[PDB]
């Protein structure tokens, strides 16, 4: 088999099980601002601060000083590594270039090489022969190169002259697709000669750590399962769940608007902080100010928990970022605070004007990470119809579902709670009446008289 | 990192995270009449009207006289600034010759800011070589340049020869997309080599003040929340809400046509003018004439309040402007009148033949601003069916929902009201019938004889 | 008729009705990384590894060393065959000169098969004249050639200059269409001058064995059917089915979330391992961890069966691969483990954001194979509404349908099971209520007090 080299890019090594083929050159074409330079810089940088491999960078447009300054925003200096003799920024902004580049390879331990960019170098018949010569001349030296080419259309031709794709051994497309006034970064591997890889696009983001590729296909169902129970915050609800929620489980609170989803989330988050356990609250519908007042009215101090460094509140609008970003933000915030419990209020708000598949691929990401890090996730979902079906087919991700619906009785609005699922546990299969007070919720008995709920009244 | 310069354009300082990279040039492409020249002038202008930095202006097609004549429209004299020495409009009626004149004028007034409108006149393989030489000679002078490009398609190639983006360090695209015979201005940053920015299209308008960018992403979920309550105009309604509406809250009055939504809006505004508090009425369904007749019929003198400078009525058809304009008009008017209560009649009318995405982002922009300005807002919504739900997922924005519906009883069409939800407050969970007279709402008792009304037919 | 040659590529021998026309050449066009070179090698390879026929290989861009290095990946040494004389890789570093060298090498080893990868390198009016001369000089030598072309668009012009199809006797197009960020390999025969073939696109995958074409059309309705019955894990269920499921049959367990579909799958697999019979569990909703916990909770040791080599659990996310892969993975695993019972949990999860056409053709490919392998299959389907139908038209594939649904009775959520249909058997036509415990299903009696359940709300 062809030996792959680890680029040390979070996700990319999963997409191409191993990394990039050693001895050959990888073509990374993409529209302007797709992260071609970043990828090629991050490739060389990773290969010097992990395997101390002497890499050479070829410039064709941007000056060396520009590349150094631009890469300084990611929190790494290139001039320091150039000073050490571990990097070489060959400034060039025909055949001799190959021999000059080859010279440095043998004169600075030919590890990794990047050429950003070649499109301006050869700025469609001549393109082939010129591109065919370079790759061949780089094969003889047997060093791992990355070539960055530009494309005009996001789903149009692979490159500018539409020829490089065949000439190259490896093809990587960086996309910056715009849908509904929103840009979605995706990276896909078009081909890998004599090796296997993951097919199709994969959502990625660019932060202070660099390119953060989020593979969904590498996510496997290995989430360890325990019989460890944890109090939901309601004694009556814990009895109804046959002891309370499972430490390694995903609880779903679906219902109509004003039913008490946030209440159950608040009470679930308070419980963590009572037992001196860390918890994160991801708000998307309400603000910290409104959350603190709302909790206060039920008799729960959210400031107290914040002062004890046991509860964190992250409020933000869904339309203020993308699903890729939102997921990263959760992971980053979870990576720092490392909570025992988590609550997303809510997924319904996060599904507002988003690809039904882009949202579906987000839920798995959050659900999986929570399960894979042994964190109890409670996600709320507001139903569009007042007074009910999932209508999303995402009930196969949740291990527990709390139903909250209104019951119009004697020209009076009354609320009702019920547990549908409790995988690996017994649950009370009754529709108990509950109401809200200054001391929180109170679950009473069920309605034996009216047997026609999840519809109307009698 | 990379030092950024403030452009002092409302919204661009948030979308850019701080502004435009210092020392480097920014390319602004767009179709004709997008606001390229405007952005160009406004950049240099605020430079010499805030940080007092001498900026030179290169004009190729448009003559200085015209530039000043057009600039005046917004309300700022350029010739006065040309007269002093803070700005120099270098009329451009070979690159080296032009570059020399620009370079020899950048040291004369020691210009910090530079705008070239436009570089798509002087002029694919040659455009790159010329453009590369231009930015290189401007990079050496360490002057923050702004270059304006020209495109033919709105979602087609970024520039004319589709090569000006890879040569530029920064790329700002201004669009003017036509959807259902309606023109929507949008601004997006494609890339910023070095720093970070906000990805995606952001709606903006051009008024007397200049460009007015409304970033919905920059708007955080930091909205002050108090337990201060206020009246609604109805004593029983205040009592039904458990002391009346919250000062800092968004109330929603949804129901079938002729249920009495406008009645609740009227009384809501009246009560404001009763406590000598200023309010605004945004009508999109009925005129001042009909409102005054209907109000006067209900025993509420809207002329009086109008003369007392406590009530301002602004009527205009929903299809008389875009959501962008309607929002900017609401904000402008609010800032002028500085009201404590605001009522919109209605959102349903504002959703008339408008994309759910563009409508979604408008309701967030209105509710968000009112919440951050400590202004109590009552928004009405007319349901499609007489006998329903919550339109879409705008129930996450309203802190209170007052449902009103009809109840056919013994061949009579009686109306019923109920506080469906109230966050942070107790509310009457009863469906009380109410009559309308020339005195206003008459909330009586609920219907215990028949329990199947609410969001149902009985 | 026209004599055809077997390529020995799984599926191509059925789609072609027998293979490629003998004496004539075949043109294989496709975008980059479709599998043109692979198909090229695999053709010649099987030639000299089955019918022991010396085949020569023309390489234009890719060097012999690379071709052998890439070929190795699949698991076959080319240099060994080059060493012997069964294959000769004629490196192509004027037509008459090249044609001469090919013609002078086709008589040396007396080559029966020939591949030219690729003819889109050497090179609209001239391409025809050259191509026509090439096939004419290969027709005279009566050698089955295979020419690889290159296309830019997936559903655009067949070849580059769109003239290589009318000059060729045979045209095979390899596609790699991207639909919702997912890459789907497809192979179609456009025409075969002389013989007949299968019209339309056919899904195929590339694995370690090489190209793997899955013709759904070639699959006939010849599926052995016996009166041999088997148990389900439940005595009452076997009795309710009129002696238990048929050995050769497809059973479907559809219903709302948490109804007990996984319970029935578990017991179904357990019973197999009870009679010392091998089974496979294909999970796409829950992990091994959760399954083992849930199983153990139900009184079924999935570790034991795992250690007894009677039960194999394979969990993986539905969006972790394409239907093509999932199918090929199921077939591969089945052939290895050779199980008598198979259960998929679930099809609904496998339909998550997938075209109804691509999903339809996957269920036919799975059910068809299991039916022709004498393997009893239980497939689960989670309904969108809690309280429904048969998803789509997949009821024509299932020989037995076990419906499970909830029945709100006196403010209690009880579950009900019923054998909806059973072909070739009597079944209990009664809606019997059933409870769940740590011992498994408890099928009790039906509800004679209320006759309005089934696919209704009462
Ligand atoms: N500190 C940062 N935080 C977040 N994102 C950043 C940061 N620095 C840069 N970026 C992002 O990465 C981009 C860097 O552009 P880059 O040069 O990697 O793209 P490219 O595809 O090579 O562009 P081109 O080849 O057209 O010049 C910026 O435009 C921005 O979107
Ligand atoms: N202090 C209180 N006393 C009594 N009842 C209260 C109190 N605060 C809230 N409630 C009741 O509980 C509801 C609050 O529910 P919650 O804030 O959890 O909203 P939700 O069900 O998540 O709906 P949404 O997210 O759509 O607003 C109010 O609508 C009201 O009916
Ligand atoms: N005083 C004003 N009030 C409101 N809108 C104005 C005012 N003055 C100009 N506008 C708007 O802004 C536009 C001016 O755009 P500008 O002159 O910058 O064009 P441009 O983007 O440079 O395009 P081009 O170069 O093709 O002329 C007008 O077409 C109009 O829609
Ligand atoms: N003076 C009055 N006396 C009695 N009933 C009245 C009087 N004026 C109006 N009404 C009643 O109340 C209604 C007034 O309409 P209102 O503005 O309260 O409803 P709306 O929900 O705003 O209707 P629309 O959806 O058409 O805007 C009339 O249709 C009528 O039934
Ligand atoms: N060992 C392997 N296991 C699985 N898949 C493989 C393996 N080796 C190669 N592949 C797949 O097959 C592809 C090889 O295709 P091939 O080299 O024939 O390209 P091609 O169709 O000739 O295109 P081009 O001429 O543009 O390179 C790889 O891109 C990869 O997706
Ligand atoms: N040990 C137990 N004792 C009692 N009841 C149990 C026990 N374990 C599970 N249950 C009940 O049976 C259900 C188990 O889910 P099961 O896998 O049988 O349903 P499912 O149809 O596969 O659900 P989903 O659609 O979510 O996959 C729980 O929701 C609970 O109601
Ligand atoms: Mg770049
Ligand atoms: Mg809530
Ligand atoms: Mg202009
Ligand atoms: Mg009205
Ligand atoms: Mg090839
Ligand atoms: Mg299940």
Swiss-Prot record, chain A:
Outcome of substituting residue 182 to C: In kaiC3; shortens the period of the circadian rhythm to 16 hours and decreases the interaction with KaiA
Consequence the record notes for mutating residue 124 to C: In kaiC2; extends the period of the circadian rhythm to 29 hours. Lower CI ATPase activity, clock slows down
Induction: Transcribed in a circadian rhythm with maximal expression at 12 hours and minimal expression 12 hours later; expressed as a kaiB-kaiC opperon, this gene does not have its own promoter. Autorepresses expression. Negatively regulated by labA. Non-phosphorylatable kaiC mutants still down-regulate the kaiBC operon.
Kinase among keywords: yes
Effect after changing residue 215 to L: In kaiC6; induces a low amplitude phenotype and decreases the interaction with KaiA
InterPro entries for this protein: Circadian_clock_KaiC-rel, Circadian_KaiC_bact, KaiC, KaiC-like_dom, KaiC_C, KaiC_dom, KaiC_N, P-loop_NTPase
Effect noted on mutating residue 92 to E: No longer binds KaiB, no formation of KaiCBA, still phosphorylated
One GO MF term attached to the UniProt entry: DNA binding
A Gene Ontology biological process term: circadian rhythm
PTM per Swiss-Prot/TrEMBL: Phosphorylated and dephosphorylated on serine/threonine residues by autocatalysis. Unphosphorylated, mono- and di-phosphorylated forms exist. The phosphorylated form correlates with clock speed. The presence of KaiA increases phosphorylation and stabilizes these forms.
Annotated positions of the Phosphoserine modification: 395
Effect seen on changing residue 451 to A: Constitutively phosphorylated
Residues covered by region (A-loop, interacts with KaiA): 452-458
Catalytic activity: L-seryl-[protein] + ATP = O-phospho-L-seryl-[protein] + ADP + H(+); L-threonyl-[protein] + ATP = O-phospho-L-threonyl-[protein] + ADP + H(+); ATP + H2O = ADP + phosphate + H(+)
Necessary cofactors: Mg(2+)
Role: The KaiABC oscillator complex constitutes the main circadian regulator in cyanobacteria. Complex composition changes during the circadian cycle to control KaiC phosphorylation; KaiA stimulates KaiC autophosphorylation, while KaiB sequesters KaiA, leading to KaiC autodephosphorylation. The Kai complex controls chromosome condensation, leading to a transcription accessible chromosome during the first half of the circadian cycle and a compact, less transcription-accessible chromosome during the latter half. Clock output pathways impact the RpaA transcriptional regulator.
Additional note from the record: 'Kai' means 'cycle' in Japanese.
Subunit structure: Homohexamer resembling 2 stacked donuts with a central pore nearly blocked on one side; hexamerization is dependent on ATP-binding. Binds 12 ATP; 6 between each subunit in both layers. KaiB only binds to phospho-Ser-431 KaiC (not doubly phosphorylated KaiC). Complex formation between KaiB and KaiC is regulated by the phosphorylation state of KaiC and by an ATP hydrolysis-driven conformation change in the CI ring of KaiC; complex formation is slow. Slow complex formation is crucial for the timing of the circadian period.
Name of the molecule in the record: Circadian clock oscillator protein KaiC
From Swiss-Prot, chains B, C:
Mutation effect (residue 124 to C): In kaiC2; extends the period of the circadian rhythm to 29 hours. Lower CI ATPase activity, clock slows down
Activity-regulation annotation: Interaction with KaiA stimulates autophosphorylation, KaiC interaction with KaiB sequesters KaiA, preventing it stimulating the KaiC kinase, leading to autodephosphorylation. A KaiA dimer is sufficient to enhance KaiC phosphorylation. Interaction of KaiA with the A-loop stimulates autokinase activity.
Record PTM Phosphothreonine, positions in chain: 396
Effect of residue 196 to W: Increases photoperiod in presence of KaiA and KaiB
Cofactor(s) this protein requires: Mg(2+)
Organism of derivation: Synechococcus elongatus (strain ATCC 33912 / PCC 7942 / FACHB-805) (Anacystis nidulans R2)
Subunit structure: Homohexamer resembling 2 stacked donuts with a central pore nearly blocked on one side; hexamerization is dependent on ATP-binding. Binds 12 ATP; 6 between each subunit in both layers. KaiB only binds to phospho-Ser-431 KaiC (not doubly phosphorylated KaiC). Complex formation between KaiB and KaiC is regulated by the phosphorylation state of KaiC and by an ATP hydrolysis-driven conformation change in the CI ring of KaiC; complex formation is slow. Slow complex formation is crucial for the timing of the circadian period.
Region (Linker): 215-227
Gene this chain is encoded by: kaiC
Binding site for ATP 2: 257-263, 298, 415, 421-423, 425, 427, 429
KaiC domain: residues covered: 1-214, 228-458
Effect on the protein of changing residue 261 to A: Induces a long period phenotype, no change in ATP-binding
Identification of the protein by name: Circadian clock oscillator protein KaiC
Phenotype of null mutants: Not essential for growth on low light, loss of circadian cycle and rhythmicity. Loss of rhythmic chromosome compaction. No visible phenotype during growth in a light/dark regime for 5-7 days (at 150 umol photons/m(2)/s). Accumulates much larger amounts of primary metabolites (especially those in and connected to the oxidative pentose phosphate pathway) in 4 hours after dark-light transition. Glycogen accumulates 4-5 hours earlier than normal, overall levels are higher, no change in glycogen degradation kinetics.
Pfam families: ATPase
Signal peptide start and end residues: none
Effect listed in the UniProt record for changing residue 203 to S: In kaiC4; extends the period of the circadian rhythm to 28 hours
Effect upon mutating residue 240 to I: In kaiC8; extends the period of the circadian rhythm to 37 hours
Positions bearing Phosphoserine: 395
Effect ascribed to mutating residue 406 to H: In kaiC12; extends the period of the circadian rhythm to 60 hours and increases the interaction with KaiA
Active site: 61 (proton acceptor in ci (kaic 1)), 285 (proton acceptor in cii (kaic 2))
Temperature dependence: ATPase activity is stable from 25 to 35 degrees Celsius.
């Amino acid at each position: 088999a062809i030996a792959k080299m680890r680029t040390m890019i979070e996700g990319f090594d999963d997409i191409s099980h191993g990394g990039l083929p050693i001895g050959r050159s990888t073509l990374v074409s993409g529209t302007s601002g797709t992260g071609k330079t970043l990828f090629s810089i991050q490739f060389l940088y990773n290969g010097i601060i992990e395997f101390d491999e002497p890499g050479v960078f070829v410039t064709f447009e941007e000056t060396p000083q520009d590349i150094i300054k631009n890469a300084r925003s990611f929190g790494w200096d290139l001039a320091k590594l150039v000073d050490e003799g571990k990097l070489f920024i060959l400034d060039a902004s025909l055949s001799a270039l190959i021999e000059r580049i080859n010279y440095a390879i043998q004169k600075y331990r030919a590890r990794r090489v990047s050429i950003d960019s070649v499109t301006s170098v050869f700025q469609s018949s001549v393109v082939r022969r010129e591109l065919f010569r370079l790759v061949a001349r780089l094969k003889q030296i047997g060093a791992t190169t990355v070539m960055t080419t530009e494309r005009i259309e996001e789903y149009g031709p692979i490159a500018r002259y539409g020829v490089e794709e065949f000439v190259s051994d490896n093809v990587v497309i960086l996309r910056n697709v715009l849908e509904g006034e929103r840009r979605r970064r995706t990276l896909e591997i078009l081909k890998l000669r004599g090796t296997s890889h993951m097919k199709g696009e994969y959502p990625f983001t660019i932060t202070d750590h660099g390119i953060n590729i989020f593979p969904l296909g590498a996510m496997r169902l290995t989430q360890r399962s325990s019989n460890v129970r944890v109090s939901s915050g309601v004694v009556r609800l814990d009895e109804m769940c046959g002891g309370g929620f499972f430490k390694d489980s995903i609880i779903l609170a679906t219902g109509a608007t004003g039913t008490g989803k946030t209440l159950l989330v608040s009470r679930f988050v308070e419980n963590a902080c009572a037992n001196k356990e860390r918890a994160i609250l991801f708000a998307y519908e309400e603000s910290r100010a409104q959350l603190l007042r709302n909790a206060y009215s039920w008799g729960m101090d959210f400031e107290e928990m914040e002062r004890q460094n046991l509860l964190k509140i992250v409020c933000a609008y869904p339309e203020s970022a993308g699903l890729e970003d939102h997921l990263q933000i959760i992971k980053s915030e979870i990576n720092d605070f490392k909570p025992a419990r988590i609550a997303i209020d809510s997924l319904s708000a996060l599904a507002r004007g988003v690809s039904n598949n882009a949202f579906r691929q987000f839920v798995i990401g959050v659900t999986g990470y929570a399960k894979q890090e042994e964190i109890t996730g409670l996600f709320t979902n507001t139903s569009d119809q007042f007074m009910s079906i999932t209508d999303s087919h995402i009930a196969a991700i949740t291990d527990t579902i709390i139903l909250l619906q209104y019951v119009e009785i004697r020209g009076e609005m009354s609320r009702a709670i019920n547990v549908f699922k409790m995988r690996g546990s017994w649950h009370d299969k009754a529709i108990r009446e509950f109401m809200i007070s200054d001391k929180g919720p109170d679950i009473k008995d069920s309605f034996r008289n009216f047997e026609r709920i999840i519809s109307g009244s009698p």
